[PDB]
Amino acid sequence: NVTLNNDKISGQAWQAMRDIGMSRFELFNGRTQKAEQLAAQAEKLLNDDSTDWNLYVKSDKKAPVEGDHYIRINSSITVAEDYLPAGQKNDAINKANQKMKEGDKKGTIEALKLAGVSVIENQELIPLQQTRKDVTTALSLMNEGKYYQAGLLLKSAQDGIVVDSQSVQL
Amino acid sequence: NVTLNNDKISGQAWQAMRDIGMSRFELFNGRTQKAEQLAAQAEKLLNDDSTDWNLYVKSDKKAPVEGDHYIRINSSITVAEDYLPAGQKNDAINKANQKMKEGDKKGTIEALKLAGVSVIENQELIPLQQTRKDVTTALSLMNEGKYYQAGLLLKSAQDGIVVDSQSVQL
Amino acid sequence: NVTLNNDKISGQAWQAMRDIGMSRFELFNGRTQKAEQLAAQAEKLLNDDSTDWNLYVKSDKKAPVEGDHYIRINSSITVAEDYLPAGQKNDAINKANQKMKEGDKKGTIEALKLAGVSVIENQELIPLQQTRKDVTTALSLMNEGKYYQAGLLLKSAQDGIVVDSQSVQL
Amino acid sequence: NVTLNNDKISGQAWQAMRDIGMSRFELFNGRTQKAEQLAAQAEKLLNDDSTDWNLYVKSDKKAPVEGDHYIRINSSITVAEDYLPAGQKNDAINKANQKMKEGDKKGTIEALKLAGVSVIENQELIPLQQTRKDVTTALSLMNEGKYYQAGLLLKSAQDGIVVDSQSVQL
Ligand SMILES: [Cl-]
Ligand SMILES: [Cl-]
Ligand SMILES: [Cl-]
Ligand SMILES: [Cl-]
Ligand SMILES: [Cl-]
Ligand SMILES: [Cl-]
Ligand SMILES: [Cl-]
Ligand SMILES: [Cl-]
Ligand SMILES: [Cl-]
Ligand SMILES: [Cl-]
Ligand SMILES: [Cl-]
Ligand SMILES: [Cl-]
Ligand SMILES: [Cl-]
Ligand SMILES: [Cl-]
Ligand SMILES: [Cl-]
Ligand SMILES: [Cl-]
Ligand code: NA
Ligand code: NA
Ligand code: NA
Ligand code: NA
């Protein structure tokens, strides 16, 4: 999948983060072997050598750990609707719908502005190498029987998700 | 998957909510046919006649719409750690790790209490019929070309996700 | 302030949680004496002997720590809007506005239902004694110079905030 | 208050956003005159002519509406803790505590890195003029008796809050 500006989003890393959360839950749920399976899947997803990880990097954002980079894992939309009289907004929304039908992203943004609607794109990001290290280290702790400590690292990986909300500039 | 109390969680409905969010994004991304495909997948997941939806119902929670019910779609954990001197907490955490290894949920909760750690389970819920109606109606609006209005219903479905955070009573 | 069902909400505890967050930030901001001042204010707010803390208790919710109770610190609204043709919804919303003008909460909920709008009340809660202990212990750690450890307890207090989202049953 | 880089944060705008949320709740709570009072307070806070609003602007972030700017209303911290053996981390945390005592922000960040801890600063931002317009227009709608529509604009103002999470570069 791609952002509004056509930059690639990592579905593998999104699924890895989902697996990380499920893994942590299974530690507390008394299913530590299931937790290891889920963390192992996350490790394979984040370290896939056939994936070109450069494609997902948000270059304009400094990661906390030296040499690391944030990658895009999801995009969503926030709209902000100004008050308009019912009639004027219907006609403006109808034109916005035509641009979406046409695949015209810029025309959609501009028609929505005439409807009093601003658009913000929320890009969910993770630091790639820091997340990889959390997963691999958590698995090592699980191998050692240090399950609570593994859970702390899985939670830290989740807490490293950030959301860059930006106005749409196509 | 199951909660700490062994109640079933709907992976299909979780994926349906993921599909609903992606569908809404694709409307703004100028890919309305992709949005319809994603909403159609969500509709099939939420309306699977081979699924016994009773298994996922949280019976002790009144849904906003008459006749409806909330279903469980995810569980996560929140811990709250009291301050303990480094030595006393290590020994208590080590015993908690043994109970997790043993699959002993109650023993895990009790050992964590000795470590100064309380456990809260966060159950993500959706109203099943209200969400079904949002998806089916959004698809109908997409068929009619009313894409912005479909996006509003998809967002409403997402805003209907609630999180019941409860202390663990096994 | 009060919930939709006229149960009291603690403005003091809300401000205490705000102070707890600011206190934690000031630790990292190199202003540990400011952090102590903010945590001391939170302690005074949560332990005010002139406040009748029973007024804010959500009795139908078991707190994680034995003998403790959750108290209400905020209420907000989530609406869920069904799709209605523009004309029918305007007339229904106009009637909802009259009930709000009249102070008629039940009539507002019922008029909104005719407009295709369901209402959910989100009650933010904290465990009172567990939060008190976090604050007092964090101050003690600050007195000892253990600032990072104090920050962990302040964060734990914040992570103990839960949101009970319930359909409106007046 | 100030960020880690000593940029000013608007306490007035933070309180305005708090007032906006309370105002919206009071509409549904059948207290429309209280909602107007709270929105009027938010309007006065955001439009204070004695405040130098330039002090709070995050210049490196484009606001959705032409001519507008994002302003800082809060800062918080996220830590990410690597796994370290208990002994090595205690000694590293003890040195971090000394730098916080000394007010040495850069030394704190560097000592925390030796403890395996990365620091992210989360800056809560609002678009100033777009938020002002939401509040003033919502009050006008309240004067007209269009309470539900006012609530939509108050919610839109809240949905315009974004969080810029950045690694600490002092
Ligand atoms: Cl297992
Ligand atoms: Cl890379
Ligand atoms: Cl580093
Ligand atoms: Cl290890
Ligand atoms: Cl398409
Ligand atoms: Cl059912
Ligand atoms: Cl109903
Ligand atoms: Cl329809
Ligand atoms: Cl200070
Ligand atoms: Cl009490
Ligand atoms: Cl207890
Ligand atoms: Cl102590
Ligand atoms: Cl009033
Ligand atoms: Cl300005
Ligand atoms: Cl504009
Ligand atoms: Cl107006
Ligand atoms: Na979206
Ligand atoms: Na979890
Ligand atoms: Na509200
Ligand atoms: Na903070």
Author numbering:
A (entry chain A), B (entry chain A), C (entry chain A), D (entry chain A): 18 to 187
The authors write:
We characterized various features of the Salmonella-derived YfdX protein, including the crystal structure that contains a novel fold, previously unknown stoichiometric features, proof of contribution to antibiotic response, and participation in the control of bacterial virulence. Moreover, we found that Salmonella YfdX plays a significant role in bacterial susceptibility to penicillin G and carbenicillin and is involved in the negative regulation of bacterial virulence in an insect larvae model. Collectively, these data indicate that the recombinant st_YfdX protein can form a dimer or tetramer in solution, and this process is affected by pH of the solution. No homologous protein was identified in this search except for kp_YfdX (Z-score 20.1): a number of proteins containing a helical bundle were listed including Nitrosomonas europaea small metal-binding protein (Z-score 9.9) and E. coli cytochrome b562 (Z-score 8.5), but their structures overlapped with the st_YfdX structure only partially, indicating that YfdX adopts a novel protein fold that has not been identified yet.
Rectangular crystals (space group F222) diffracted to the resolution of 1.4 Å were obtained in a crystallization condition with pH 4.6 (Crystal I), implying that this crystal might consist of the st_YfdX tetramer. Its asymmetric unit contains a single st_YfdX molecule that is composed of six α-helices, one 310-helix, and three β-strands. One 310-helix is located in the middle of the α2–β1 loop. Of note, we figured out that a tetramer-shaped oligomeric form of st_YfdX is shown in our crystal lattice, which can be fairly well-matched to that of kp_YfdX. In contrast, we could not find any crystallographic evidence for the formation of a st_YfdX trimer in our structure. We next structurally analyzed the intermolecular binding between st_YfdX monomers in the tetrameric form. The two st_YfdX molecules designated as Mol A and Mol B in Figure 3 interact with each other mainly through very tight hydrophobic contacts. Hydrophobic interactions provide additional force for the complex formation between Mol A and Mol C, which are mediated by Tyr100 and Ile137 from one molecule and Pro81′′, Tyr87′′, Leu158′′, Leu170′′, Val179′′, and the hydrocarbon part of Thr154′′, Lys163′′, and Gln166′′ from the opposite molecule (right). Overall, the interaction between Mol A and Mol B mainly depends on tight hydrophobic interaction and appears to be tight and dense, whereas that between Mol A and Mol C is maintained by the combination of hydrogen bonds and loose hydrophobic interaction but seems to be relatively weak and detachable.
